[PDB]
Amino acid sequence: SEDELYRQSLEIISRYLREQATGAKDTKPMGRSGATSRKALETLRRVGDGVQRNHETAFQGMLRKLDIKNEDDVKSLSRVMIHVFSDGVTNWGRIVTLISFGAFVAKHLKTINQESCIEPLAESITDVLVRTKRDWLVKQRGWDGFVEFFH
Ligand SMILES: CCc1sc2ncnc(N[C@H](Cc3ccccc3)C(=O)O)c2c1-c1cccc2[nH]ccc12
């Protein structure tokens, strides 16, 4: 507790992954910094859906290489994301791609009756993002900078 960037990041990524997987939109209000979290999630529905639709073939190719089947295969994805995501350049384009790929995997997890793995997947993405890019996210004004960037 007393890490608002982490709390706000978890809220936005977890809601996106669950909405993408199930189709149900959460009507429950956002916590502290509501305006920003709603806009961020609206941005993700536009830009995130756009990445998955536009690059379906590349996403399907990667999903098949990673061969996700169960909780163990999801736990394994964290190491891949550190290597693929964290060890590349940092920009909102790559951040949206990571979260979009999470949504792509979450839809995959729903289709194989592995919904229980969607929350850990969301936790793992948020940890990779916030733990490895903390100072960059702060410099870029966090989720307010994300919304302004993709306006
Ligand atoms: C673990 C899956 C991840 S996390 C991740 N985090 C950031 N960026 C990524 N991709 C962009 C390249 C890119 C752009 C649009 C569509 C598809 C790919 C980048 O690296 O700049 C990926 C990937 C990823 C997913 C699917 C195929 C992939 N090919 C190489 C990475 C990658």
From Swiss-Prot:
<feature type="short sequence motif" description="BH2">
    <location>
        <begin position="135"/>
        <end position="150"/>
    </location>
</feature>
<comment type="function">
    <text>Involved in the regulation of apoptosis versus cell survival, and in the maintenance of viability but not of proliferation. Mediates its effects by interactions with a number of other regulators of apoptosis. Isoform 1 inhibits apoptosis. Isoform 2 promotes apoptosis.</text>
</comment>
<protein>
    <recommendedName>
        <fullName>Induced myeloid leukemia cell differentiation protein Mcl-1</fullName>
    </recommendedName>
</protein>
<feature type="short sequence motif" description="BH1">
    <location>
        <begin position="83"/>
        <end position="103"/>
    </location>
</feature>
<feature type="short sequence motif" description="BH3">
    <location>
        <begin position="40"/>
        <end position="54"/>
    </location>
</feature>
<comment type="subunit">
    <text>Interacts with HIF3A (via C-terminus domain). Interacts with BAD, BOK, BIK and BMF. Interacts with PMAIP1. Interacts with BBC3. Isoform 1 interacts with BAX, BAK1 and TPT1. Heterodimer of isoform 1 and isoform 2. Homodimers of isoform 1 or isoform 2 are not detected. Isoform 2 does not interact with pro-apoptotic BCL2-related proteins. Interacts with RTL10/BOP. Interacts with BCL2L11; may sequester BCL2L11 to prevent its pro-apoptotic activity. Interacts with GIMAP5 and HSPA8/HSC70; the interaction between HSPA8 and MCL1 is impaired in the absence of GIMAP5.</text>
</comment>
<feature type="cross-link" description="Glycyl lysine isopeptide (Lys-Gly) (interchain with G-Cter in ubiquitin)">
    <location>
        <position position="25"/>
    </location>
</feature>
<feature type="cross-link" description="Glycyl lysine isopeptide (Lys-Gly) (interchain with G-Cter in ubiquitin)">
    <location>
        <position position="28"/>
    </location>
</feature>
<comment type="similarity">
    <text>Belongs to the Bcl-2 family.</text>
</comment>
